[PDB]
Design a protein around this ligand. Structure first.
Ligand SMILES: O=P(O)(O)OC[C@H]1O[C@](O)(COP(=O)(O)O)[C@@H](O)[C@@H]1O
Ligand SMILES: O=P(O)(O)OC[C@H]1O[C@](O)(COP(=O)(O)O)[C@@H](O)[C@@H]1O
Ligand SMILES: O=P(O)(O)OC[C@H]1O[C@](O)(COP(=O)(O)O)[C@@H](O)[C@@H]1O
Ligand SMILES: Cn1cc(C(=O)c2cccc(Cl)c2Cl)cc1C(N)=O
Ligand SMILES: Cn1cc(C(=O)c2cccc(Cl)c2Cl)cc1C(N)=O
Ligand SMILES: Cn1cc(C(=O)c2cccc(Cl)c2Cl)cc1C(N)=O
Lengths: 511, 513, 512
C-alpha cells in the first residue's frame, strides 16, 4: 500500500511504528510549511525562483544584520521571483514574507584567554568599554546586578564561556570562570534563569517593525518574548495599519518557557527558537521545551515553528547528517506546522538542496503520523462550543478520514475556516481558496493548508461564484496531482457572503 | 446538570458509571421504538388512541392465532386511531403495522391429559395409528424427520420446556426416551428440539397465506419466525414478491442454529428480533444474555435494526408497576444498543397496557442519556469501513458535528429512510428528525434508534430549493412544539444536491429560527 | 474457546460484545456471593444442606418479620447444616449469617384480625386511613391503620401513598382515592416518597434486634434506610465494643441515601442497593442509574456491594425465571456487584433450590463475560499511587494471574484484608483465602472472587512450615473442587513476618 496506510490501520502506537514502511510511497502533497532565511547565498531573482520551485513557502528576513535598503531589495526580489509564476494561477504558489526582529541584546565591550577556574569581575564602569581583559569586563545592560543572584550563571558568546557569580553588589559583580575560552569584543551575553527587564521592543525594533508595515510583510517573528506584555507592545507598535500581520512569538529563554500559556494566548503563533533556547537552558532539555510548546500549540490551534540547526551540516555538505534527517522528521511528527532553514539558505553552499531535503523529509513524515490516535485525542481535548464553523471543521475532518479523501476544499476570506480545519490534523491536504492575497500568504503558517489565490472575476449569482471557486480548486489538485476525476473530496463553504459564516460541508466526486 | 452530561464528560467507563445521577433529567426525546402487541386489552379505537399518546410506535399483529378478518379489523382500528391526530401534522405521530408469522412448529397428537412421571421411560412414535392414542408410554408427533435430526443422549422438550426428555434409544421409525423433568402431558403441545438442525420449511402453508395477506393489508414490516439460515429470509422475500418489495424483513432468531448462523441471516435480513421467549426454551436460560449482547452488538456494527423482545415487563400483566428485574432488563437492553423494545402479553391481554407502554417510554429515555457516547462513537468509527460512499461520510460527519456543538437535533430529509438510517448507526445523542413525504418511510423509521419521523403534508413547491427550505422549517416547528430545542439553538441539517433518492451529501450547521 | 477468551482478546468493548459466545463454557469457580433469605420454605436443616450445595454463601435473616425465638432456631439450623460438612476441612464451605434490620418502616394493621386474610381493592374506589388505635386489627376495604403517628404532619393533599411493595397506589384528597387496586393484605410496607419522614435512625425494635445479633455471633448487619453518615455511626455505636468486628452494610433505599452516598460509603463496611424500597422512593425508571452509580463507586473505593430484590421474583411460583430475570442477574454481575441476593425466592417460595442454582449458573456465565482488559486498566488508573507494600503486592498478583491465566490466587490472611485488596482489582482467577479466623472466613463472602477456606490444622512451631502447610491446604482445595490440576500455575500471597499487615510476597508456583 501507499502513504503508510497499513500503519494507519494499527490498533496501537507500537504496532503503528512496526508497520512503518520505506517501500510505501507518499502522496504528492506536502503539508508542513518551509521557512527559508534569505541572505547572500539565496538573494538573487534566479536563485529565489529555484527556491520557490524546490518548495519555499515563507521568506524570512533577519533584522539582526543588514540595513533597510538591503532588506527592501531582498523583498523586491522575492516578489519578482514569485510573480514570474503568476501567469498560470492554477500552478501559482503564494510566497509569504516574514520579518524576524533583532530583539533586546546584552553585549560585551583581539582575544583574551580566560583561565578555567579564575576570577573575572563584571563592571558597569564606562571607561572600561575599550578596556576588557581577563580581570575586567563591561556590559551594556545597566540592571544586570538586580536580576542576577549570588550563584547565578552568566554566559558569554553563544554559551562558549560560562561564568558563575560569587558576590553581588550594585555597581559590580565578581564571578568565577566555570567554562573557559577566548574572550572577545562585541559578543552576546546570556543570563540563565533571570527575568530580564530590558524592553520588549528596542529602539531599532520599533523602526524595523514600522518598516515591516510599509513593506507589506505577512508575519512578524518577534525575538525574546518573555511575557504577554511583550506581545502587546509589538502589537501596539504595528498599530491599526499592521493589525492583520501575524505576531509569532520567539520563545528563547527560561522565562518565556515558564510563562508559555500567557504568551500563546496573546500571540498569533510560536517559534521554538532553539538556537538561543539551547544557550539559555541546558542543551539536554531543549526537546522537552520543543514537545511542550508544539503540543500546546496543537491543543490551541495556533501555528508552531521549529527552528535552528535542522540541517546545519548542509551549509558545507550536499547531504545532511543522520541526526539532521531525524530532527526534521520528528519535528513534523511532533506536530510542527512549520520547519525553518537559517544559515542553510542564508549563507551556505547548498541552499536548494536543503529546501528539497526539508520537502522530502516532511512529506515522508506526514504519511507516518498516527492519525487514528491523533484525531481521537484532539477531539476529546477540544471543548464543546456553539461556534458553527468549529462544528463544521471537525465534521469535515471526520468525513475526510471516512472516505480517505483527496482533499478538503475550504473557501475562506480571512484564513480562519481553513485554520479551524488544520487544527484537527487531517491526512487530506486542505486547499484554501481565496481572493485575498495576504490570506493566501499567511496560510503557509498552518499545517495542511495549500493556499490558492483565485484571480477569476466575480460571477453575477453568488452561488455560481462559490461553485467557480470550488472548481478552481478542483483544477489545482488535478494539476498538482493530489487527486483525479472521480476521487471523492470534502467541500467547505458558507450560507451567505462575508467572514464568520462557514457552516456547510459537502462530499463530492471530482468532475 | 441535565441529560447525564456530567457523566458524558468522564474519561473512563467506570467513572461514567460513578457519575450516573438520578437528579439529572433527560430531554423529552425518547429514541428507542416501542413495539406493542395488540390483542383483547388494547384493540379498540379509544384504547389505541391512548396507546399512541402513551408512546406506541409499532403495532404488532401475532398471526399465530386469529382469523384474517379479525386481524384486518385490528389494522383498521390501528389506522383509525392513528389518523385521528392528523389534523395537527406538527403533533402527528406515524404508527407502523407489523406482521408476526406463526412459523413452522412441531406439535404432539391427541390423548384431555395424562401424567408423565419423573425418572420413567417414554416412547416416541411417527406411526399414524397412534396419532390419537397418546398416553404415558406412547407419544405421537407431526414432524416425520425427527429420527434423522436427533442422536443418542440429546434432549427433547415438550410444552414450552415443561417436560424434558432424553433419548436413550433411537430407531428409523421411532425413539425410546427417559423422562428427565416430569409433568402434565396434554394434547397438541409444542415440541422443541434443542441443538437440532431441523428441516421444517422457512415458510409454512399457513405462513404463505398470511404473508400475501400483509401485502394486501399494506403492512410496513414482517417479523418472520424461526429463521435458521440465509435461504430462509430469501424464501420470505420471494413469497412477499415485488408487490411487497419495500416491506422490511425482520428475522426472529429462535434457536441454537439461528444463533450459530447469525452472520449470514443478518446479511440477508432488514433487521433482527432477539426472540428470547423461544430462544430460552431452546437454549439454557442463563445463556440468553450472551446471545442478546452478541446479536445487538453485531447488528450495531452492521447498522441494521435489532428488537429486544419477550417478558421485558412481564409482571405488569397483573400489576401496575413492574419488578426491579424488569426495570433493569429494559434499561440494559437500551444500553446494549437495541433499536426497539417489545411488549407481548403486557399490551395484548394484561390489565395495565397503557402503564406498560408508559414504563418502556420512561425507562428508555433514562437509559439513552446514560449511554457512554464518548467511548461508543469512538469505537463505532474505528470499526467502520473506509468506503467511497458520499452519504456514509456525510452521516459520520453530521454525528461528529452534533457532538461538537451538543446540537438539539439532526434534521434529515429522506425519501426511502436510508439517509436517516445511516446517521442512526453512528448513535448520536441528538434526536434524528427524519422529514419525508412518503407515508411508509415515516412508519418504517421507528425501527432505527434515534429517528423521530415526521410526515410532511404541505404540497410540493415549484422551486425545489424552496421545497427543501419548507421541509427544514417544518422540522424546526416540530422540535419547537415537542420541546427538543428552541429559537437560537444550533441543529444539524442533512440535504442532498438534487431531487430523488441517494444524493444526501450536504451537512449544514443551522440556527433554529 | 472456553471462558469467553475469544471475547477477552477484543480490542474494543463493542467487539467484546460481538464475540460473546453461547458455546463457550465457563470455569468451575463462581466468584459472586449468593445471599439467601431464610424463611418457612428454606428453614429446615434438610433444605439448608441442599442450599449450601446449590451455592449459598450467606444466610440473611429478615427481622421485619418474626420473633427472636424463630430467628435463633433458624440460626441454629443454618449452623447445623454448615457444620455437617466440617469433618473434611478441604470440602467445608463457610456460611455467613447476616441480620437485616427492620429500620424506620411504616406498616399496615391486620385484615379482620389475622396475618393471612386478604381483601380486594378496585381502581377508582375510596378508602380512609385513620390514626385511632381501635381500628388496628379490623382493617378492611374501607378503613386502614398504620403505625406512623405523624402521617398527617408531613404529607399534602395530592401526595401519593404506596402500600405493599408499591403495588397499591393511593392519593390523598386522610381520605384517599385508590389509584391502583389489587390484593390488600395484612402487615404490609407503606411508602411516602414526597414526605420528609422524621422517624428515628435506630428504633427501639432495631436495638433489641442488634443486641440479639451480637449475642448470636452474626457476621454482618444489613442496616435499613441509611440516610447520612451519622446513621452509620449510630449503628456502629449501638454495636459497641462487643460487636466491633461485625460488618455494617448500609442499605440505600431512598432519595437522601443516594444523594449522600459518598459520606455513607466512607463510614460503612459495604453497601446494599435495596432496589425494592428504592424503586418506590424514587421513580422506578431511575433505579438502574442508582444501581450502576453505587456499584461503580463501591468498586472504585474497594468496598463490597450487594445487588438486591426481585432478581428472580417469578421463581416464587415457577421452576424457571423470566427473560428479564436472567438478564438482571447477569447485568448485576457484569456491573460489578460483589454479591447477589434472593429474598422471597428462598424465604417462602415453591422452588427455593432452583433459585439458588439459577443464580449460580447466570453469575458464572456473566463472570466470563467481563471485559477484563478495559476493567483492570481502569481500576489501575483510578488507584492512587501509594507507599503501601500490600497494595503493590496485590496489584502485581492480579497482573501475574492474567499473564499465566491462573487457576487461582492463594492468599494467607488474618483479618480478610490482604484478600480484599486482591478482590478490588477484579481478577478472573478465584481468590483462595486461607485463614484460621472463622469470622474472617464468613465475612470474606462479601467480596467478589474470594473463596474462603478455614484451616483447622494446629500451629507448627516453625512459622515457615505453618505458612507452607496453609499454602498446600489451599492447593488441595482447588484440586478437590476442580479449580486446577497438578502442573497448573497459581499465584501465592504471603508475608515476611507473622500477624496482620505484612503481605509483601508474591509467588508464582506450580501445583504439586
Ligand atoms: O474563513 P472566513 O474568513 O470566515 O471566510 C469564510 C466565508 O467564505 C464564504 O464561503 C464565501 O464568501 P465570499 O463570497 O464573501 O467570499 C462565506 O460563505 C464564508 O463565511
Ligand atoms: O434517504 P434517501 O431516500 O436517499 O433520500 C434523500 C433525498 O432527499 C432529498 O434531500 C430531497 O429529495 P426530494 O426532493 O426528492 O424529496 C434529496 O436531495 C436526497 O437525495
Ligand atoms: O490480611 P491480613 O490480616 O493482613 O493477614 C496477612 C498476614 O498473614 C500472614 O501471611 C501470615 O501470618 P500468620 O502466620 O500470623 O497467620 C502474614 O505474613 C501477613 O501479614
Ligand atoms: C510515528 N509517530 C506518530 C506520532 C503521532 O502521530 C502523534 C504525534 C503527536 C501527538 C500525537 Cl497524539 C500523536 Cl498520535 C508520533 C510519532 C513518533 N514521534 O514516533
Ligand atoms: C452505562 N453503560 C453505557 C454503555 C454504553 O454506552 C455502551 C454500550 C454498548 C457498547 C458500547 Cl461500546 C458502549 Cl460504550 C453500557 C452501559 C452499561 N451496560 O451499563
Ligand atoms: C459485557 N460487559 C462487560 C462489562 C465490563 O466488563 C465492565 C463492567 C463495569 C465496569 C467496566 Cl470498566 C467494565 Cl469494562 C459490562 C458489560 C455489559 N454491561 O454489557
Amino acid at each position: 500500500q501507499t502513504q503508510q496506510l497499513h500503519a494507519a490501520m494499527a490498533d496501537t502506537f507500537l504496532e503503528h511504528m512496526c508497520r512503518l514502511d520505506i517501500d510505501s510511497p507518499p502522496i504528492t502533497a506536502r503539508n508542513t510549511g518551509i521557512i527559508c532565511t534569505i541572505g547572500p547565498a539565496s538573494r538573487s531573482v534566479e536563485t529565489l525562483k529555484e527556491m520557490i520551485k524546490s518548495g519555499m513557502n515563507v521568506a524570512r528576513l533577519n533584522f539582526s544584520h543588514g540595513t533597510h535598503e538591503y532588506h527592501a531589495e531582498t523583498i523586491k526580489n522575492v516578489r519578482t521571483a514569485t510573480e514570474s509564476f503568476a501567469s498560470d494561477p492554477i500552478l501559482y504558489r503564494p510566497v509569504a514574507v516574514a520579518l524576524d526582529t533583532k530583539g533586546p541584546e546584552i553585549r560585551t565591550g583581539a582575544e583574551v584567554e580566560l583561565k578555567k577556574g579564575a576570577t573575572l569581575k563584571i563592571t558597569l564602569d564606562n571607561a572600561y568599554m575599550e578596556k576588557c581583559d581577563e580581570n575586567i569586563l563591561w556590559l551594556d545592560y545597566k540592571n544586570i546586578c538586580k536580576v542576577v543572584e549570588v550563584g547565578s550563571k552568566i554566559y558569554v558568546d553563544d554559551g562558549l564561556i560560562s561564568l558563575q557569580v560569587k558576590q553581588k553588589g550594585a555597581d559590580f559583580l565578581v564571578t568565577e570562570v566555570e567554562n573557559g575560552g577566548s574572550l572577545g569584543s562585541k559578543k552576546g551575553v546570556n543570563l540563565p534563569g533571570a527575568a530580564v527587564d530590558l524592553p520588549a521592543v528596542s529602539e531599532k525594533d520599533i523602526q524595523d517593525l514600522k518598516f515591516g508595515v510599509e513593506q507589506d510583510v505577512d508575519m512578524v517573528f518577534a525575538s525574546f518574548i518573555r511575557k504577554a506584555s511583550d506581545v502587546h507592545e509589538v502589537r501596539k507598535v504595528l498599530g491599526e495599519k499592521g493589525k492583520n500581520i501575524k505576531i509569532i512569538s520567539k520563545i528563547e529563554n527560561h522565562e518565556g518557557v515558564r510563562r508559555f500559556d500567557e504568551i500563546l494566548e496573546a500571540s498569533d503563533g510560536i517559534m521554538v527558537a532553539r538556537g538561543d533556547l539551547g544557550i539559555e537552558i541546558p542543551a539536554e532539555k531543549v526537546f522537552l521545551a520543543q514537545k511542550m510548546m508544539i503540543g500546546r500549540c496543537n491543543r490551541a490551534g495556533k501555528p508552531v515553528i521549529c527552528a535552528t540547526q535542522m540541517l546545519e551540516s548542509m551549509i558545507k555538505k550536499p547531504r545532511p547528517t543522520r541526526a539532521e534527517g531525524s530532527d526534521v522528521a520528528n519535528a513534523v511528527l511532533d506536530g510542527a506546522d512549520c520547519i525553518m532553514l537559517s544559515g542553510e539558505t542564508a549563507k551556505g553552499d547548498y541552499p536548494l538542496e536543503a529546501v528539497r531535503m526539508q520537502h522530502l523529509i516532511a512529506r515522508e513524515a506526514e504519511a507516518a503520523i498516527y492519525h487514528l490516535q491523533l484525531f481521537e485525542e484532539l477531539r476529546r481535548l477540544a471543548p464543546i462550543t456553539s461556534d458553527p464553523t468549529e462544528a463544521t471543521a471537525v465534521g469535515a475532518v471526520e468525513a475526510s478520514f471516512k472516505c480517505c479523501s483527496g482533499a478538503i476544499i475550504v473557501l475562506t476570506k480571512s484564513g480562519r475556516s481553513a485554520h479551524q480545519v488544520a487544527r484537527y490534523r487531517p491526512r487530506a491536504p486542505i486547499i484554501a481558496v481565496t481572493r485575498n492575497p495576504q490570506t493566501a500568504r499567511q496560510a503557509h503558517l498552518y499545517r495542511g493548508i495549500f493556499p490558492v489565490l483565485c484571480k477569476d472575476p466575480v460571477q453575477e449569482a453568488w452561488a455560481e461564484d462559490v461553485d467557480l471557486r470550488v472548481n478552481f480548486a478542483m483544477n489545482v489538485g488535478k494539476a498538482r496531482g493530489f487527486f483525479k476525476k472521480g476521487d471523492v473530496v470534502i467541500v467547505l463553504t458558507g450560507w451567505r457572503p462575508g467572514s464568520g459564516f462557514t457552516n456547510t460541508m459537502r462530499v463530492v466526486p471530482v468532475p
